[PDB]
Structures are given as C-alpha cells and as structure tokens.
Paper text:
SOS1 is one of the major guanine nucleotide exchange factors that regulates the ability of KRAS to cycle through its “on” and “off” states. One of the major regulators of this process is the Son of Sevenless (SOS) protein, a guanine nucleotide exchange factor (GEF) that acts as a key activator for KRAS function. The binding between KRAS and SOS proteins helps facilitate the turnover of GDP-loaded KRAS into its GTP-loaded state. Additionally, functional genomic screens have identified that several cancer cell lines addicted to KRAS signaling are particularly sensitive to genetic perturbation of SOS1.15 Functionally, KRAS mutations lead to a reduction in GTPase activity, resulting in a higher population of GTP-bound KRAS and increased RAS-pathway signaling. GTP-bound KRAS also binds to an allosteric site on SOS1, leading to an increase in SOS1 GEF activity, thereby ensuring a high population of active KRAS. Herein, we report the design of a new class of phthalazine-based SOS1 binders that effectively disrupt the SOS1:KRAS protein–protein interaction.
As expected from our modeling efforts, the phthalazine core makes a π-stacking interaction with His905, and the N–H from the C1-benzyl amine substituent creates a crucial hydrogen bond with Asn879. The chiral α-methyl on the benzylic amine fills a small cavity in the pocket and positions the phenyl group for an edge-to-face interaction with Phe890. The ideal C7-substituent should extend from the SOS1 binding pocket into the interface of the KRAS:SOS1 protein–protein interaction between the Arg73 of KRAS and Asn879/Tyr884 of SOS1, thereby disrupting the PPI, while also providing favorable drug-like properties. The C7-piperazine protrudes out of the binding pocket and into the region where the SOS1:KRAS PPI occurs, driving the disruption of the SOS1:KRAS complex. Interestingly, based on atomic distances in the crystal structure, the nitrogen on the 3-position of the phthalazine core is clearly protonated and makes a salt bridge with the carboxylate of Glu902. This is in stark contrast to the previously reported quinazoline-based SOS1 binders that require a methyl group in this position and are unable to utilize this interaction. Finally, the C4-methyl substituent protrudes into the solvent front, which indicated that this vector could be used as an additional opportunity for growth and further tuning of the physicochemical properties of our phthalazine scaffold. Further modeling using the co-crystal structure of compound 15 suggested that a small hydrophilic hole existed in the back pocket of the protein and incorporation of more polar substituents on the phenyl ring may be tolerated. X-ray co-crystal structures of these inhibitors reveal a unique salt bridge between the phthalazine core and Glu902 of SOS1 that has not been reported with previous SOS1 binders.
Residue numbers in the entry: 567 to 589, 598 to 746, 753 to 1044
C-alpha cells in the first residue's frame, strides 16, 4: 500500500535506525511518533504493548499530549481522487474509487479501530487521568462523540458505557462464611476503651489486614513509574501509594509508642509479647506488609536496644519474631520465596519492589541515542512495568473476613506523632527508650504501672 506522504501525515515515515529499535516484535526504543504508530499498528493487535504503554507513558509524555497524538493518528488523510473519478463526482455520479476503497479497508479502518481500542483501554484501566484533568475527559468525549462510521459505532458505545460507569462508580458479598469477630476486654460498642491490650489480638490483625488490603488494592501501577512518588507532584501522581506508605509509618510508630511509653518493665514485656502475637496472625493471613511493620518496629532504635524487655520474651515468641525478620535478610530473598508460593488473598510488602524499581530507574538511561537522535528508552519502562505486575497480581483477591467498623475506624485515626514532626517524635521515642532502660553504667530504675486491666493475652487460637 502507498502510505500517505510526510507533508500531510506524520505516522507514515518508514522505520529506520534513527526512530525505532527492536529487541510480534518487541520494541526496545524509539521516538514518541514511532511509539504511537506501533501502539496502533494496522497489521496486528499488540495487547501487551498497549498495556505496558498506558501504564508507563507518563514518564515520557503528558496525558494531554498523548490524546493529541492519538487524535492526529486517527485523522488519516485520504488520497486525491483520480481524474476519471473527480469528473464523476462533478456530474453527481458515483466514482469508482478502487484504490481509495483498498486504502480505507487495509489501512484507515484498521488503524482507526486500534486508536479506539487504545481509547477503551485508557478509560478502563487508567481513568484517573481523566479524574485529575476534566478538560482531558472533555476532549476525549468530544473526540469519540464525533466519530462517524458504522464499523466504529460499537466501539464508541462501549467507550461511552465505560466512561459513564466510571463516573457513577465515583460516588461509592462473601463467597464463604467469615469467621466470628473476636473480642477481649473491650466490649462491642465501647470505643472509649479501645487500645493495644484491650482489643483481641486476633481481631487487631484481622482488621489491620482488611485495612491494609484495601489500601494495597487501590494502588495503581503508574504510581510506581518514573519515581513520581518522590517528586514534587507526588500527591497528584501517587495518592494511593503515599496513603499506603503513610499508614505503614503511622502503624510502625504506634507500635514503638506503645512500647517505649510503657515505663513498667513487666507491662512492657506484655506489650511486646502482644505485638508478636499480632504478627503471628499476620503470618496466618499472609499479610506480609503487616508482618514487616512489626519487624520494623522491633528493629527500630528505641525498641531493639531494650535488652531487659526481650530477655523475658518466651523462646517460642523469639523464634516467631526471628523467622519474620529473616524475610528481610539477603535483599528480602525469603519474602519473595514465600510470596511466590502463597495463594491469594495476601497483602504484599512494597518496600523491596520500590527499591528494585529505583535501581532500574537509576541504572538505565531515559533516552537512547542513535546517529545523534534521542529515542525514548521503552525497555526501561517495560522492566519497571514487569515489577509492578508482580505486586499487582494480588490486587483482585478479597479477604473472607468481616469488617468491624468501630475497630477499623480506630486504626484509621491512629495519630502517634500527634502534632509534632516525625524527626522530633523519633528523637522523643529514643530519649524515652533511654529513660525506661538506661545504658550499661546507669542502674535500672523501677516505674509504676499504667494499666489497670489484666495483661494476660487471650491467645491467637480462634475460638470456634
Ligand atoms: C527476633 C528479635 C528481633 C528481630 C526483629 N531482629 C533481628 N532478628 N534476627 C536477626 C538475625 C537480626 C539481625 C540484625 C538486626 N538488626 C537490628 C537493627 N539494627 C541492625 C541489625 C535485627 C535482627 C528484634 C529484637 C528482639 C528479638 C528477640 F530475639 F528478642 F525476639
């Protein structure tokens, strides 16, 4: 086929070593024009490239620029009519349009259907681009609303149904019987007495797992691309990832706060022993994020140095805490090995993936140069997308655990730092640790009790 000239169309230039590199062919690098062309190739459908592109394109192209590029890709100019056909059109007769029909059937219609397929995948899996930019959605609805054609009528309707469902879903069922909600000292409804030791450790780990599962499942892969969660626009590009990270920081600091602010040695042992029991139920539910929240708390500077406290921790709980720490040893080797074999539901730990993504961002160049021509390094984005795909494969499996609205709201409003900054609070926790257990030369003072309720744990065995 005779593709349109370059003076009227920019997506028909032949491939060369200066505009696209390969590795269905796998694209390695290329210009933004060559990526849009291969994103909507007329010879075959490329679902893997479409999924990887729309997840990672924001690291090299703005959403407004992408919509303009795919609209320009859509409006393919038709060739000039032949002389014999133009005089039939002048007389009001129907032209032959032999080559014109073959060009529409073999190029224009296949490309235009690929552009619409990209538009459907965009609004279906990355609709947040249109929530953050209303004008982007106005352009998208304006574009698909003015598409004329019979073969494209079904595509316009499907994209419309998805856009409408996304707007309606913005306002807001077990397969098995969930276990019974466990309670300890705090009776149901008495939200004034909810605390670490008053609530049941089984239900503390259950509700935290339900809370952390939802926070994990709301994280989209694009929030982990281009290190956007560490830039100025982190609040706009990674709101769910930051909500997941800030929750992990709040819960970790709360565990440390419950330990160092318990000045009595006997009560502090019961506090640490209860948190280890909470970690044990985290392992049962395969909530690996909750497991390492306890590991990070026990390894922090104020808590790890409490030799007098951990001396009274029973040996069965020491081994449970040891096996939980070994998940982080050797670049989280054992954590990946356990997660890869565990069946969902589960809550992954984001730390190692963010670490391996950042090493890919820093270890690979943004652009590749060929004959002095900068090309978007797309294999770099594909490698980052593969990592986000490993975390995302558990995004859809729910837990078979009943939500307790009072307990869930208690952990959502945990503010251990109160109104002070983190550096001031972390320095306060360490100075509090030196107070409850001074260093080697200084003696160990006694402190009065602060809890008036029994310190005995009800256990981690579900009472059925
Ligand atoms: C198991 C455990 C733990 C766990 C949570 N901590 C650890 N576990 N294993 C090993 C082999 C560790 C090796 C180094 C290491 N870090 C601490 C932070 N500074 C850098 C070195 C912490 C380890 C903490 C506290 C107490 C206990 C107890 F044995 F008492 F239960």
């Amino acid at each position: 086929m005779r593709l349109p000239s370059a003076d009227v169309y920019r997506f028909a230039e032949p491939d060369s070593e200066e505009n696209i590199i390969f590795e269905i062919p796998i694209i390695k690098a290329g210009t933004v024009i060559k990526l849009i062309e291969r994103l909507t190739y007329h010879m075959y459908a490329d679902p893997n490239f479409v999924r990887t592109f729309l997840t990672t394109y924001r690291s090299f192209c703005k959403p407004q620029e992408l919509l303009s590029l795919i609209i320009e890709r859509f409006e393919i100019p038709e060739p000039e009519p032949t002389e014999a056909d133009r005089i039939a059109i002048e007389n009001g007769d129907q032209p032959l349009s032999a080559e014109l029909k073959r060009f529409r059937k073999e190029y224009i219609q296949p490309v235009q259907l690929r552009v619409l397929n990209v538009c459907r995948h965009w609004v279906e899996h990355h609709f947040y681009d249109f929530e953050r930019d209303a004008y982007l959605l106005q352009r998208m609805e304006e574009f698909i609303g003015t598409v004329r054609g019979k073969a494209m009528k079904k595509w316009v309707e499907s994209i419309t149904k998805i856009i409408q469902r996304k707007k309606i879903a913005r306002d807001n069922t077990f397969q098995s019987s969930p276990p019974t909600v466990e309670w300890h000292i705090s009776r149901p409804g008495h939200i004034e007495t909810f605390d670490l030791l008053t609530l049941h450790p089984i239900e503390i780990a259950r509700q935290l797992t339900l809370l952390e599962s939802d926070l994990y499942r709301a994280v989209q892969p694009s929030e982990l691309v281009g290190s956007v969660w560490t830039k100025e626009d982190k609040e706009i590009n990674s709101p769910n990832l930051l909500k997941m990270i800030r929750h992990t920081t709040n819960l970790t600091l709360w565990f440390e706060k419950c330990i160092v602010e318990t000045e009595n040695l006997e009560e502090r042992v019961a506090v640490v022993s209860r948190i280890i029991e909470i970690l044990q139920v985290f392992q049962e539910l395969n909530n690996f994020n909750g497991v390492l929240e306890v590991v990070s708390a026990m390894n922090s500077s104020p808590v790890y140095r409490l030799d007098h406290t951990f001396e009274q921790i029973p040996s069965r709980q020491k081994k449970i805490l040891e096996e939980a720490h070994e998940l982080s040893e050797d670049h989280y080797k054992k954590y990946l090995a356990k997660l890869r074999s565990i069946n969902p539901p589960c809550v992954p730990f984001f730390g190692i993936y963010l670490t391996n993504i950042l090493k890919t961002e820093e270890g690979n160049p943004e652009v590749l140069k060929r004959h002095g021509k900068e090309l978007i390094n797309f294999s770099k984005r594909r490698k980052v997308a593969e990592i986000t795909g490993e975390i995302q494969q558990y995004q859809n499996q729910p837990y078979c655990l009943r939500v307790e609205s009072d307990i869930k709201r208690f952990f959502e409003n945990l503010n251990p730092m109160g109104n002070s900054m983190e550096k001031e609070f972390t320095d306060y926790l360490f100075n509090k640790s030196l107070e409850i257990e001074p260093r080697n030369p200084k003696p160990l003072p006694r402190f009065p009790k602060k809890y008036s309720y029994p310190l005995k744990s009800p256990g981690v065995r579900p009472s059925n």
